[PDB]
Amino acid sequence: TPEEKLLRAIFGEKASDVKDSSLRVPNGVSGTVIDVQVFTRDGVEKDKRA
Amino acid sequence: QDVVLGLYYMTRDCVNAKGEGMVLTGPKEAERLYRSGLASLHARVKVRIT
Amino acid sequence: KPLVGTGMERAVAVDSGVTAVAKRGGVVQYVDASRIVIKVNEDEMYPGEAGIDIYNLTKYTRSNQNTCINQMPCVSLGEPVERGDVLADGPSTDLGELAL
Amino acid sequence: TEFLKPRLVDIEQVSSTHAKVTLEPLERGFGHTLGNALRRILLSSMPGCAVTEVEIDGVLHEYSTKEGVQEDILEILLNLKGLAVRVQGKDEVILTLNKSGIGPVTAADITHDGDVEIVKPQHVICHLTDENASISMRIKVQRGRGYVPASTRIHSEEDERPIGRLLVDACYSPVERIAYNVEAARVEQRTDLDKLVIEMETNGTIDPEEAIRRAATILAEQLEAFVDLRDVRQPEVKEEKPEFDPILLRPVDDLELTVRSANCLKAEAIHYIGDLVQRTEVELLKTPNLGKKSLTEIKDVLASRGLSLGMRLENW
Amino acid sequence: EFLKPRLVDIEQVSSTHAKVTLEPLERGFGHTLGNALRRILLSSMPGCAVTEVEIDGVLHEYSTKEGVQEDILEILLNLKGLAVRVQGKDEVILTLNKSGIGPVTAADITHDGDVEIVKPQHVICHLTDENASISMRIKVQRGRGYVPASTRIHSEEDERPIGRLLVDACYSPVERIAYNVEAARVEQRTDLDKLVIEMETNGTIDPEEAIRRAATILAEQLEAFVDLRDVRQPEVKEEKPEFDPILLRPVDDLELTVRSANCLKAEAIHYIGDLVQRTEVELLKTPNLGKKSLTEIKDVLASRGLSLG
């Protein structure tokens, strides 16, 4: 919207073209993460953690 | 159910107990007697009431 | 354990697959909180390649309802065990008995 | 270790004889412990004076009737138990009532003795009819702790007394009724705290505040034998900063400075060069009639004594 | 006019079990003190207990060490049962390192001066391997009552080492308490009562200290009760006089310097009211009146709790 454009011009706020989606912990549950598994399809570049 | 049971117990009288036939000047001293352990919670007694 | 049971507790405990049960009775040679290694009795040793019996236990994995199913060793070093004895208690099991 | 001590001691005494007392915040469970102890002590063990026995000059037994009194003897017993008497010096005294004429014999008609004060002078006792209205009797007041009913004395009254001696329950404790409620209270972050509501009505003689007061007194006196931690302490340790610095002691005068300058530092609360040395520029500069000349003057003199401007030193 | 209880013989039948007797109790307070003392004893008695444990080769409560048979959780619970007595410090870090086959007893702990382990026979784990070795560091704090992990989470305070293994602190040494009132025949008296308090603890607190601590706490709260204010007061005044005395007083009453004096004078500033009402610019225009004078009048109205605005 215009006014937000005005704000971006004012402060010079480079808008990030990527939205957040991270899988955060459900509300009101607290415990220890005991294990992690990672499944990459064949072909894609395995990350270091995999 | 619990309430009614408590009242039933408290109000029921018994032929013979502690303080049979002693006369109290009012209810507040009745409570004095029961909480002081000088008479059973139910016992036939003559009290003045307004 | 239940203080007042009915006797079925052992039947159910063994029959459920969560307990670990002895196949050839013997002596507990090695016990660790992941595996039970049993030295077979010479009678029960297969003539060709009897060797010892190794039971790997299952540690906290997620059940269908999100409950934990963990097996703990019951017996101690050097204890003699017989065929059909209860090695490890599964979830909500004690010394072979059902303890809900 | 470090406990939580109660604050905000609020007391709403509707009808001075009736006192409601609210207290927070209290650690878990202490509501019932103290409510119960206090209740027990107040109720069962309180030194007081009360009517024990009375002798009627005209009738000999509690079941007979006196002519011209509509109230039966037991009725008078019940009325007189309510009489609140406070004796000062004597341990047991035997008062006599002798009254004539029509109407309700009231507490005011009691024989006026030295030590005894009747807290409720308007208590009716008996109703006397016309033209006869002659009553004389002896009411015995004795001191004791707690509550002792007549029935236990007459049970253990192997010391048989002459006829007419009507025994009465001795209600020494001045409190007629006492109760305590415990309810939820949170200290801004801790929710497991409690409020204590003590409702107490006494029989006039003693004021409620003092009732609670001496109840707690007795309990503290019982415990006193054990509690002994009564430690003392000091704020901090001595000084390691002697503010006697050998060059800074002498007075400003040694600077042989202009009058103007002097009068200005003086009027600026500067006495010894030990004050000046610890003086903010802005101050010396604002002093009216203190300009470049006067300021440079002060500065040059401080430089001559080997010192600088805006000097620093703590504790002076 | 009463008696008062004197602390008499304190029997130790076992290290854990103790009976404390009180002879000269007035009738009626037997139960009162029995109950109060029991309450305080069970509720608030300070004790020490393990607060946390750090073992190296374990990231979280649920993994398992080679060469041991207890699971990590059972080791924590057994440590929870560990009864330890520290004298001076509040937080001590004990170090346990043992190898080889055997049941790990409490005695194997690296023994520090201030620490007394009352029952070293308390088992912790069972080794099962020639080379199986455990090393751990137990942090023990003193506290009262019962504190679970979940509240302690607030006070993380850089728990950054993920190796930290938190256990709930059951800060309470007393396990069981009973009392009996029995007729206390003193050589010249009819009706006195004797209190017999039977107390069973984890074997850390001695009876006399416990009983004294309880009496202390009760004494503190009853002292708190002793005063009852009932006080009232009239103070509440009005807070806006005609013009506020600290605004009526005349400039003369301010006393500064002949210059500033004649300045206010010939400036028509006669009252500290008119004064506090005027701003800098006001005086800047007066001839021979400038920055320093005015600033002086300001530094003085500084201690006169009034500014210029």
mmCIF file with all atom_site columns, N, CA, C and O in Angstrom, chain D residues 2-3 5 9 23 29-30 32-34 36 40 45 145 209 213 222 225-226 228 286-287 290-291, chain E residues 1 3 5 22 28-29 31-32 35 39 144 212 218 220 224-226 228-230 291-292 295:
data_model
loop_
_atom_site.group_PDB
_atom_site.id
_atom_site.type_symbol
_atom_site.label_atom_id
_atom_site.label_alt_id
_atom_site.label_comp_id
_atom_site.label_asym_id
_atom_site.label_entity_id
_atom_site.label_seq_id
_atom_site.pdbx_PDB_ins_code
_atom_site.Cartn_x
_atom_site.Cartn_y
_atom_site.Cartn_z
_atom_site.occupancy
_atom_site.B_iso_or_equiv
_atom_site.pdbx_formal_charge
_atom_site.auth_seq_id
_atom_site.auth_comp_id
_atom_site.auth_asym_id
_atom_site.auth_atom_id
_atom_site.pdbx_PDB_model_num
ATOM 1   N N  . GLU D 1 2   ? 15.219 -17.407 54.606 1.00 0.00 ? 2   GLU D N  1
ATOM 2   C CA . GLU D 1 2   ? 14.485 -16.151 54.492 1.00 0.00 ? 2   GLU D CA 1
ATOM 3   C C  . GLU D 1 2   ? 13.019 -16.486 54.241 1.00 0.00 ? 2   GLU D C  1
ATOM 4   O O  . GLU D 1 2   ? 12.674 -17.035 53.191 1.00 0.00 ? 2   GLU D O  1
ATOM 5   N N  . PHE D 1 3   ? 12.155 -16.143 55.191 1.00 0.00 ? 3   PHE D N  1
ATOM 6   C CA . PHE D 1 3   ? 10.738 -16.441 55.081 1.00 0.00 ? 3   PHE D CA 1
ATOM 7   C C  . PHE D 1 3   ? 9.963  -15.251 54.534 1.00 0.00 ? 3   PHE D C  1
ATOM 8   O O  . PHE D 1 3   ? 10.521 -14.211 54.179 1.00 0.00 ? 3   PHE D O  1
ATOM 9   N N  . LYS D 1 5   ? 7.012  -12.748 55.678 1.00 0.00 ? 5   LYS D N  1
ATOM 10  C CA . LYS D 1 5   ? 6.372  -12.162 56.847 1.00 0.00 ? 5   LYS D CA 1
ATOM 11  C C  . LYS D 1 5   ? 5.133  -11.365 56.446 1.00 0.00 ? 5   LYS D C  1
ATOM 12  O O  . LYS D 1 5   ? 5.134  -10.711 55.399 1.00 0.00 ? 5   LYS D O  1
ATOM 13  N N  . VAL D 1 9   ? -2.017 -5.379  57.583 1.00 0.00 ? 9   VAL D N  1
ATOM 14  C CA . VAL D 1 9   ? -2.810 -5.963  58.662 1.00 0.00 ? 9   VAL D CA 1
ATOM 15  C C  . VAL D 1 9   ? -4.074 -5.115  58.768 1.00 0.00 ? 9   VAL D C  1
ATOM 16  O O  . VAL D 1 9   ? -4.114 -4.095  59.453 1.00 0.00 ? 9   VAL D O  1
ATOM 17  N N  . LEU D 1 23  ? -5.705 -10.842 57.048 1.00 0.00 ? 23  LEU D N  1
ATOM 18  C CA . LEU D 1 23  ? -4.249 -10.827 57.018 1.00 0.00 ? 23  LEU D CA 1
ATOM 19  C C  . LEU D 1 23  ? -3.687 -11.553 55.811 1.00 0.00 ? 23  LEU D C  1
ATOM 20  O O  . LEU D 1 23  ? -4.049 -12.704 55.553 1.00 0.00 ? 23  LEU D O  1
ATOM 21  N N  . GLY D 1 29  ? -0.001 -23.212 53.986 1.00 0.00 ? 29  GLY D N  1
ATOM 22  C CA . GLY D 1 29  ? -0.308 -23.969 55.170 1.00 0.00 ? 29  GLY D CA 1
ATOM 23  C C  . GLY D 1 29  ? -0.266 -23.186 56.457 1.00 0.00 ? 29  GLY D C  1
ATOM 24  O O  . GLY D 1 29  ? -0.872 -23.620 57.444 1.00 0.00 ? 29  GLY D O  1
ATOM 25  N N  . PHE D 1 30  ? 0.413  -22.039 56.494 1.00 0.00 ? 30  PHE D N  1
ATOM 26  C CA . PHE D 1 30  ? 0.481  -21.324 57.757 1.00 0.00 ? 30  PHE D CA 1
ATOM 27  C C  . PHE D 1 30  ? -0.853 -20.712 58.135 1.00 0.00 ? 30  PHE D C  1
ATOM 28  O O  . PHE D 1 30  ? -1.120 -20.509 59.328 1.00 0.00 ? 30  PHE D O  1
ATOM 29  N N  . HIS D 1 32  ? -3.782 -22.239 58.204 1.00 0.00 ? 32  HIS D N  1
ATOM 30  C CA . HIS D 1 32  ? -4.475 -23.131 59.120 1.00 0.00 ? 32  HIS D CA 1
ATOM 31  C C  . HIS D 1 32  ? -3.687 -23.339 60.402 1.00 0.00 ? 32  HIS D C  1
ATOM 32  O O  . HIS D 1 32  ? -4.279 -23.407 61.481 1.00 0.00 ? 32  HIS D O  1
ATOM 33  N N  . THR D 1 33  ? -2.358 -23.399 60.328 1.00 0.00 ? 33  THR D N  1
ATOM 34  C CA . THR D 1 33  ? -1.601 -23.670 61.545 1.00 0.00 ? 33  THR D CA 1
ATOM 35  C C  . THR D 1 33  ? -1.846 -22.571 62.569 1.00 0.00 ? 33  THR D C  1
ATOM 36  O O  . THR D 1 33  ? -2.206 -22.845 63.722 1.00 0.00 ? 33  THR D O  1
ATOM 37  N N  . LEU D 1 34  ? -1.722 -21.311 62.148 1.00 0.00 ? 34  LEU D N  1
ATOM 38  C CA . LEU D 1 34  ? -1.880 -20.226 63.104 1.00 0.00 ? 34  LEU D CA 1
ATOM 39  C C  . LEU D 1 34  ? -3.343 -20.000 63.440 1.00 0.00 ? 34  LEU D C  1
ATOM 40  O O  . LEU D 1 34  ? -3.675 -19.762 64.604 1.00 0.00 ? 34  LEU D O  1
ATOM 41  N N  . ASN D 1 36  ? -5.572 -22.183 63.688 1.00 0.00 ? 36  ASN D N  1
ATOM 42  C CA . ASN D 1 36  ? -5.957 -23.252 64.597 1.00 0.00 ? 36  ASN D CA 1
ATOM 43  C C  . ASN D 1 36  ? -5.341 -23.051 65.971 1.00 0.00 ? 36  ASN D C  1
ATOM 44  O O  . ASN D 1 36  ? -6.030 -23.169 66.988 1.00 0.00 ? 36  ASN D O  1
ATOM 45  N N  . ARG D 1 40  ? -7.571 -22.356 69.274 1.00 0.00 ? 40  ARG D N  1
ATOM 46  C CA . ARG D 1 40  ? -7.538 -23.282 70.395 1.00 0.00 ? 40  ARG D CA 1
ATOM 47  C C  . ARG D 1 40  ? -7.223 -22.540 71.681 1.00 0.00 ? 40  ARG D C  1
ATOM 48  O O  . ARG D 1 40  ? -7.912 -22.700 72.696 1.00 0.00 ? 40  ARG D O  1
ATOM 49  N N  . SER D 1 45  ? -8.286 -21.652 76.754 1.00 0.00 ? 45  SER D N  1
ATOM 50  C CA . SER D 1 45  ? -7.403 -21.234 77.850 1.00 0.00 ? 45  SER D CA 1
ATOM 51  C C  . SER D 1 45  ? -7.229 -19.719 77.906 1.00 0.00 ? 45  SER D C  1
ATOM 52  O O  . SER D 1 45  ? -6.260 -19.213 77.350 1.00 0.00 ? 45  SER D O  1
ATOM 53  N N  . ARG D 1 145 ? -9.248 -20.159 84.507 1.00 0.00 ? 145 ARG D N  1
ATOM 54  C CA . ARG D 1 145 ? -8.794 -20.165 83.126 1.00 0.00 ? 145 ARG D CA 1
ATOM 55  C C  . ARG D 1 145 ? -9.692 -21.081 82.308 1.00 0.00 ? 145 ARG D C  1
ATOM 56  O O  . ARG D 1 145 ? -9.966 -22.212 82.721 1.00 0.00 ? 145 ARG D O  1
ATOM 57  N N  . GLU D 1 209 ? -8.908 -6.411  69.910 1.00 0.00 ? 209 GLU D N  1
ATOM 58  C CA . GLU D 1 209 ? -7.490 -6.277  69.623 1.00 0.00 ? 209 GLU D CA 1
ATOM 59  C C  . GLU D 1 209 ? -6.661 -6.854  70.759 1.00 0.00 ? 209 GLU D C  1
ATOM 60  O O  . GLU D 1 209 ? -5.770 -7.681  70.538 1.00 0.00 ? 209 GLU D O  1
ATOM 61  N N  . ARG D 1 213 ? -4.144 -9.998  71.134 1.00 0.00 ? 213 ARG D N  1
ATOM 62  C CA . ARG D 1 213 ? -2.821 -9.600  71.583 1.00 0.00 ? 213 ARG D CA 1
ATOM 63  C C  . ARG D 1 213 ? -2.297 -10.581 72.613 1.00 0.00 ? 213 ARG D C  1
ATOM 64  O O  . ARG D 1 213 ? -1.268 -11.235 72.417 1.00 0.00 ? 213 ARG D O  1
ATOM 65  N N  . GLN D 1 222 ? 5.037  -19.570 75.723 1.00 0.00 ? 222 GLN D N  1
ATOM 66  C CA . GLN D 1 222 ? 5.268  -21.011 75.718 1.00 0.00 ? 222 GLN D CA 1
ATOM 67  C C  . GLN D 1 222 ? 6.469  -21.365 74.857 1.00 0.00 ? 222 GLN D C  1
ATOM 68  O O  . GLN D 1 222 ? 7.351  -22.116 75.282 1.00 0.00 ? 222 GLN D O  1
ATOM 69  N N  . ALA D 1 225 ? 11.048 -20.915 75.267 1.00 0.00 ? 225 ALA D N  1
ATOM 70  C CA . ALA D 1 225 ? 12.098 -21.759 75.817 1.00 0.00 ? 225 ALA D CA 1
ATOM 71  C C  . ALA D 1 225 ? 13.066 -22.236 74.743 1.00 0.00 ? 225 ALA D C  1
ATOM 72  O O  . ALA D 1 225 ? 14.250 -22.440 75.028 1.00 0.00 ? 225 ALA D O  1
ATOM 73  N N  . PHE D 1 226 ? 12.591 -22.421 73.513 1.00 0.00 ? 226 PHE D N  1
ATOM 74  C CA . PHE D 1 226 ? 13.423 -22.951 72.439 1.00 0.00 ? 226 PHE D CA 1
ATOM 75  C C  . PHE D 1 226 ? 14.032 -21.868 71.559 1.00 0.00 ? 226 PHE D C  1
ATOM 76  O O  . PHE D 1 226 ? 15.249 -21.844 71.357 1.00 0.00 ? 226 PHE D O  1
ATOM 77  N N  . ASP D 1 228 ? 15.970 -19.124 70.161 1.00 0.00 ? 228 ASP D N  1
ATOM 78  C CA . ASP D 1 228 ? 17.126 -18.423 70.710 1.00 0.00 ? 228 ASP D CA 1
ATOM 79  C C  . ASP D 1 228 ? 17.893 -17.601 69.689 1.00 0.00 ? 228 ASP D C  1
ATOM 80  O O  . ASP D 1 228 ? 18.690 -16.748 70.094 1.00 0.00 ? 228 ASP D O  1
ATOM 81  N N  . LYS D 1 286 ? 29.869 30.249  36.377 1.00 0.00 ? 286 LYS D N  1
ATOM 82  C CA . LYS D 1 286 ? 28.608 30.976  36.474 1.00 0.00 ? 286 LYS D CA 1
ATOM 83  C C  . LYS D 1 286 ? 28.619 32.073  37.526 1.00 0.00 ? 286 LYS D C  1
ATOM 84  O O  . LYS D 1 286 ? 27.782 32.979  37.458 1.00 0.00 ? 286 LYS D O  1
ATOM 85  N N  . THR D 1 287 ? 29.521 32.007  38.494 1.00 0.00 ? 287 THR D N  1
ATOM 86  C CA . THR D 1 287 ? 29.560 32.987  39.565 1.00 0.00 ? 287 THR D CA 1
ATOM 87  C C  . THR D 1 287 ? 29.537 34.398  38.983 1.00 0.00 ? 287 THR D C  1
ATOM 88  O O  . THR D 1 287 ? 30.456 34.769  38.238 1.00 0.00 ? 287 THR D O  1
ATOM 89  N N  . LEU D 1 290 ? 32.601 36.732  37.733 1.00 0.00 ? 290 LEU D N  1
ATOM 90  C CA . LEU D 1 290 ? 33.753 35.848  37.531 1.00 0.00 ? 290 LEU D CA 1
ATOM 91  C C  . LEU D 1 290 ? 33.880 35.546  36.039 1.00 0.00 ? 290 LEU D C  1
ATOM 92  O O  . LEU D 1 290 ? 33.138 34.725  35.494 1.00 0.00 ? 290 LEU D O  1
ATOM 93  N N  . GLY D 1 291 ? 34.826 36.219  35.388 1.00 0.00 ? 291 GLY D N  1
ATOM 94  C CA . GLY D 1 291 ? 35.051 36.112  33.957 1.00 0.00 ? 291 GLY D CA 1
ATOM 95  C C  . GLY D 1 291 ? 36.419 35.577  33.604 1.00 0.00 ? 291 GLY D C  1
ATOM 96  O O  . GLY D 1 291 ? 37.092 34.947  34.426 1.00 0.00 ? 291 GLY D O  1
ATOM 97  N N  . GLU E 2 1   ? 0.003  -16.667 84.633 1.00 0.00 ? 1   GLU E N  1
ATOM 98  C CA . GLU E 2 1   ? 0.403  -17.665 85.617 1.00 0.00 ? 1   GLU E CA 1
ATOM 99  C C  . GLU E 2 1   ? 0.278  -19.066 85.027 1.00 0.00 ? 1   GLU E C  1
ATOM 100 O O  . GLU E 2 1   ? -0.779 -19.691 85.099 1.00 0.00 ? 1   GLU E O  1
ATOM 101 N N  . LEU E 2 3   ? 2.977  -22.630 83.390 1.00 0.00 ? 3   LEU E N  1
ATOM 102 C CA . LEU E 2 3   ? 4.281  -23.255 83.255 1.00 0.00 ? 3   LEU E CA 1
ATOM 103 C C  . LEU E 2 3   ? 4.736  -23.132 81.806 1.00 0.00 ? 3   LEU E C  1
ATOM 104 O O  . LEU E 2 3   ? 4.086  -22.484 80.982 1.00 0.00 ? 3   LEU E O  1
ATOM 105 N N  . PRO E 2 5   ? 7.381  -25.379 78.657 1.00 0.00 ? 5   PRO E N  1
ATOM 106 C CA . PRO E 2 5   ? 8.019  -26.668 78.381 1.00 0.00 ? 5   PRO E CA 1
ATOM 107 C C  . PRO E 2 5   ? 9.533  -26.576 78.306 1.00 0.00 ? 5   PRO E C  1
ATOM 108 O O  . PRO E 2 5   ? 10.093 -25.645 77.723 1.00 0.00 ? 5   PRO E O  1
ATOM 109 N N  . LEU E 2 22  ? 8.842  -33.601 75.949 1.00 0.00 ? 22  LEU E N  1
ATOM 110 C CA . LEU E 2 22  ? 8.641  -32.315 76.611 1.00 0.00 ? 22  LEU E CA 1
ATOM 111 C C  . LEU E 2 22  ? 7.742  -32.499 77.831 1.00 0.00 ? 22  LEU E C  1
ATOM 112 O O  . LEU E 2 22  ? 6.560  -32.827 77.672 1.00 0.00 ? 22  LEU E O  1
ATOM 113 N N  . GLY E 2 28  ? -4.087 -28.777 77.586 1.00 0.00 ? 28  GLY E N  1
ATOM 114 C CA . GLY E 2 28  ? -4.748 -28.122 76.490 1.00 0.00 ? 28  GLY E CA 1
ATOM 115 C C  . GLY E 2 28  ? -3.816 -27.695 75.376 1.00 0.00 ? 28  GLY E C  1
ATOM 116 O O  . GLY E 2 28  ? -4.230 -27.677 74.213 1.00 0.00 ? 28  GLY E O  1
ATOM 117 N N  . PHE E 2 29  ? -2.567 -27.365 75.695 1.00 0.00 ? 29  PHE E N  1
ATOM 118 C CA . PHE E 2 29  ? -1.605 -27.021 74.660 1.00 0.00 ? 29  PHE E CA 1
ATOM 119 C C  . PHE E 2 29  ? -0.904 -28.237 74.088 1.00 0.00 ? 29  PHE E C  1
ATOM 120 O O  . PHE E 2 29  ? -0.175 -28.104 73.100 1.00 0.00 ? 29  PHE E O  1
ATOM 121 N N  . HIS E 2 31  ? -1.998 -30.810 72.329 1.00 0.00 ? 31  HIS E N  1
ATOM 122 C CA . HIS E 2 31  ? -2.348 -30.969 70.926 1.00 0.00 ? 31  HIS E CA 1
ATOM 123 C C  . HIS E 2 31  ? -1.965 -29.732 70.129 1.00 0.00 ? 31  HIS E C  1
ATOM 124 O O  . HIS E 2 31  ? -1.544 -29.843 68.974 1.00 0.00 ? 31  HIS E O  1
ATOM 125 N N  . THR E 2 32  ? -2.111 -28.547 70.719 1.00 0.00 ? 32  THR E N  1
ATOM 126 C CA . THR E 2 32  ? -1.811 -27.328 69.979 1.00 0.00 ? 32  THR E CA 1
ATOM 127 C C  . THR E 2 32  ? -0.385 -27.362 69.454 1.00 0.00 ? 32  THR E C  1
ATOM 128 O O  . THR E 2 32  ? -0.140 -27.195 68.251 1.00 0.00 ? 32  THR E O  1
ATOM 129 N N  . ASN E 2 35  ? 0.439  -30.269 66.948 1.00 0.00 ? 35  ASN E N  1
ATOM 130 C CA . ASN E 2 35  ? -0.019 -30.003 65.594 1.00 0.00 ? 35  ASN E CA 1
ATOM 131 C C  . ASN E 2 35  ? 0.825  -28.931 64.921 1.00 0.00 ? 35  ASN E C  1
ATOM 132 O O  . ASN E 2 35  ? 1.279  -29.114 63.786 1.00 0.00 ? 35  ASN E O  1
ATOM 133 N N  . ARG E 2 39  ? 3.219  -29.508 61.684 1.00 0.00 ? 39  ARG E N  1
ATOM 134 C CA . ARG E 2 39  ? 2.981  -28.761 60.462 1.00 0.00 ? 39  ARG E CA 1
ATOM 135 C C  . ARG E 2 39  ? 4.271  -28.129 59.971 1.00 0.00 ? 39  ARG E C  1
ATOM 136 O O  . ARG E 2 39  ? 4.697  -28.345 58.829 1.00 0.00 ? 39  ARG E O  1
ATOM 137 N N  . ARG E 2 144 ? 14.664 -25.157 50.718 1.00 0.00 ? 144 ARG E N  1
ATOM 138 C CA . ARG E 2 144 ? 13.533 -25.604 51.515 1.00 0.00 ? 144 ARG E CA 1
ATOM 139 C C  . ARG E 2 144 ? 12.367 -25.983 50.612 1.00 0.00 ? 144 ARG E C  1
ATOM 140 O O  . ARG E 2 144 ? 12.153 -25.370 49.563 1.00 0.00 ? 144 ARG E O  1
ATOM 141 N N  . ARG E 2 212 ? 14.230 -26.816 67.309 1.00 0.00 ? 212 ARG E N  1
ATOM 142 C CA . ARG E 2 212 ? 14.547 -25.414 67.539 1.00 0.00 ? 212 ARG E CA 1
ATOM 143 C C  . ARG E 2 212 ? 14.203 -24.562 66.328 1.00 0.00 ? 212 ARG E C  1
ATOM 144 O O  . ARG E 2 212 ? 13.667 -23.461 66.474 1.00 0.00 ? 212 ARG E O  1
ATOM 145 N N  . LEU E 2 218 ? 7.872  -20.342 64.220 1.00 0.00 ? 218 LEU E N  1
ATOM 146 C CA . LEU E 2 218 ? 6.618  -19.988 64.867 1.00 0.00 ? 218 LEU E CA 1
ATOM 147 C C  . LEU E 2 218 ? 6.781  -18.720 65.691 1.00 0.00 ? 218 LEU E C  1
ATOM 148 O O  . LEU E 2 218 ? 5.906  -17.849 65.684 1.00 0.00 ? 218 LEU E O  1
ATOM 149 N N  . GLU E 2 220 ? 8.768  -16.282 65.159 1.00 0.00 ? 220 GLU E N  1
ATOM 150 C CA . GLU E 2 220 ? 8.841  -15.151 64.246 1.00 0.00 ? 220 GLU E CA 1
ATOM 151 C C  . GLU E 2 220 ? 7.445  -14.719 63.824 1.00 0.00 ? 220 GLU E C  1
ATOM 152 O O  . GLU E 2 220 ? 7.097  -13.531 63.890 1.00 0.00 ? 220 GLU E O  1
ATOM 153 N N  . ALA E 2 224 ? 5.295  -11.299 64.678 1.00 0.00 ? 224 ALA E N  1
ATOM 154 C CA . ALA E 2 224 ? 4.610  -10.511 63.661 1.00 0.00 ? 224 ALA E CA 1
ATOM 155 C C  . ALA E 2 224 ? 3.180  -10.195 64.084 1.00 0.00 ? 224 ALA E C  1
ATOM 156 O O  . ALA E 2 224 ? 2.690  -9.079  63.884 1.00 0.00 ? 224 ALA E O  1
ATOM 157 N N  . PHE E 2 225 ? 2.499  -11.178 64.673 1.00 0.00 ? 225 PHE E N  1
ATOM 158 C CA . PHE E 2 225 ? 1.137  -10.954 65.156 1.00 0.00 ? 225 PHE E CA 1
ATOM 159 C C  . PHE E 2 225 ? 1.068  -10.021 66.359 1.00 0.00 ? 225 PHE E C  1
ATOM 160 O O  . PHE E 2 225 ? 0.081  -9.292  66.499 1.00 0.00 ? 225 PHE E O  1
ATOM 161 N N  . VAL E 2 226 ? 2.075  -10.027 67.235 1.00 0.00 ? 226 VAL E N  1
ATOM 162 C CA . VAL E 2 226 ? 1.922  -9.378  68.541 1.00 0.00 ? 226 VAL E CA 1
ATOM 163 C C  . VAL E 2 226 ? 1.411  -7.957  68.373 1.00 0.00 ? 226 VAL E C  1
ATOM 164 O O  . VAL E 2 226 ? 0.452  -7.541  69.032 1.00 0.00 ? 226 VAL E O  1
ATOM 165 N N  . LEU E 2 228 ? -0.714 -5.124  66.729 1.00 0.00 ? 228 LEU E N  1
ATOM 166 C CA . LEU E 2 228 ? -1.950 -4.943  65.976 1.00 0.00 ? 228 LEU E CA 1
ATOM 167 C C  . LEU E 2 228 ? -2.190 -3.446  65.983 1.00 0.00 ? 228 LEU E C  1
ATOM 168 O O  . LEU E 2 228 ? -2.407 -2.859  67.045 1.00 0.00 ? 228 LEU E O  1
ATOM 169 N N  . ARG E 2 229 ? -2.136 -2.819  64.813 1.00 0.00 ? 229 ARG E N  1
ATOM 170 C CA . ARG E 2 229 ? -2.049 -1.367  64.792 1.00 0.00 ? 229 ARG E CA 1
ATOM 171 C C  . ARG E 2 229 ? -3.319 -0.725  65.336 1.00 0.00 ? 229 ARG E C  1
ATOM 172 O O  . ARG E 2 229 ? -3.288 -0.056  66.376 1.00 0.00 ? 229 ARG E O  1
ATOM 173 N N  . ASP E 2 230 ? -4.451 -0.910  64.656 1.00 0.00 ? 230 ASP E N  1
ATOM 174 C CA . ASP E 2 230 ? -5.694 -0.243  65.040 1.00 0.00 ? 230 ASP E CA 1
ATOM 175 C C  . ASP E 2 230 ? -5.547 1.280   64.992 1.00 0.00 ? 230 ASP E C  1
ATOM 176 O O  . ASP E 2 230 ? -6.519 2.012   65.197 1.00 0.00 ? 230 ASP E O  1
ATOM 177 N N  . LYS E 2 291 ? 24.062 36.289  30.821 1.00 0.00 ? 291 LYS E N  1
ATOM 178 C CA . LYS E 2 291 ? 24.093 34.850  31.066 1.00 0.00 ? 291 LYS E CA 1
ATOM 179 C C  . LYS E 2 291 ? 24.397 34.497  32.523 1.00 0.00 ? 291 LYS E C  1
ATOM 180 O O  . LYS E 2 291 ? 23.622 33.792  33.174 1.00 0.00 ? 291 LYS E O  1
ATOM 181 N N  . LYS E 2 292 ? 25.537 34.959  33.044 1.00 0.00 ? 292 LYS E N  1
ATOM 182 C CA . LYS E 2 292 ? 25.975 34.541  34.378 1.00 0.00 ? 292 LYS E CA 1
ATOM 183 C C  . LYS E 2 292 ? 24.980 34.896  35.484 1.00 0.00 ? 292 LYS E C  1
ATOM 184 O O  . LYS E 2 292 ? 24.645 34.049  36.320 1.00 0.00 ? 292 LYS E O  1
ATOM 185 N N  . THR E 2 295 ? 21.790 32.719  35.072 1.00 0.00 ? 295 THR E N  1
ATOM 186 C CA . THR E 2 295 ? 22.164 31.345  35.412 1.00 0.00 ? 295 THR E CA 1
ATOM 187 C C  . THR E 2 295 ? 22.325 31.175  36.915 1.00 0.00 ? 295 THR E C  1
ATOM 188 O O  . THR E 2 295 ? 22.074 30.091  37.452 1.00 0.00 ? 295 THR E O  1
#
